[PDB]
Symmetry: C6
Subunit: 67 residues, 6 copies
RNA sequence: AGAGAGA
């Protein structure tokens, strides 16, 4: 499953990611964890729990390895 | 389940949390309770029942410790 | 279930509630009934059937006691 | 079930209804049919298949008697 | 059987011109060439578009349709 | 299943498929992967994981056999 | 709460 490999990779490598939300608002930071419904992001020291239903797009700084 | 540990934590510690909503609005308060579809928040003494579908982000006042 | 308690209490007590919609429009009235997907609100005697998917928040006039 | 009861009443009574969509757009007409995902609205004799996921609110001209 | 399927199959069969309005109020016109549970394959001047049903608000035909109700 | 046939032909013929999001924002690229919930688009060498629930429309460059 | 898409 592409979604979970992608999120695990950005997590295990501490890649910076911009997370665009459905409404265009944006967050940047690193992925600390995720489950079926949410992604736990950290931006400059602070946790943000984001619902996946509210996410449009993860644009990572560096590109991920996946199959 | 990170979601429920998070919410159950900020509920147990009475942490303050900014709820950001998809409609652009952001709300600060304390979590009184939640189920699978909704979060009960209190913002200055007033209840608000908020649908999870309408929420984008929670930003706690102080980071929550979780098992991941 | 928190949602069902809340809605049934504001229904039983005829509590006025503000409903904030996903589009930021704001409705005010009293809940006359609900099922899994919808809420029946009366505003100045006029019925509205609202899909819960279009609601963001209910803010009661007085706080509900919940178990 | 409030939803079915409401939609079946306004259908069989031919009640004029404003349908407000998620974006605030308002369509006015009579419901001629519905199923699990859609509602068939007739406006000035034009058929519109509307997805329930796009609907916010039905506001009938006259109140609908329900159980 | 269900109203959505008859409606989409009818306009597809007749190559009816249709406005599709999307959740954000954008509108496309075209003919339906097919659909499945999740998507509608519209053609607006020769040009294929795969539209998710979740992004669609309303199908409005210019020309009224036959439905078993 | 039209969806899966389409995403696949734009993916194998590495088509410039443009992607309109619910908020109207648009991105061009080629599809490298998809699952039930998500699309992996490369745009300008950069990877982007897009949730399907956020996508409005894929508009290809050349049309697809289905 | 009245509908043409680069966050």
């Amino acid at each position: 499953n592409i979604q979970d490999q992608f999120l695990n990779q950005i997590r295990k490598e501490n890649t910076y990611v911009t997370v665009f939300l459905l409404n265009g608002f944006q967050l940047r930071g690193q992925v600390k964890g995720f489950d079926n419904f949410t992604v736990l992001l950290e931006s400059e020291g602070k946790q943000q729990l984001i619902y996946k239903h509210a996410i449009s797009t993860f644009a990572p700084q560096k590109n991920v390895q996946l199959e």
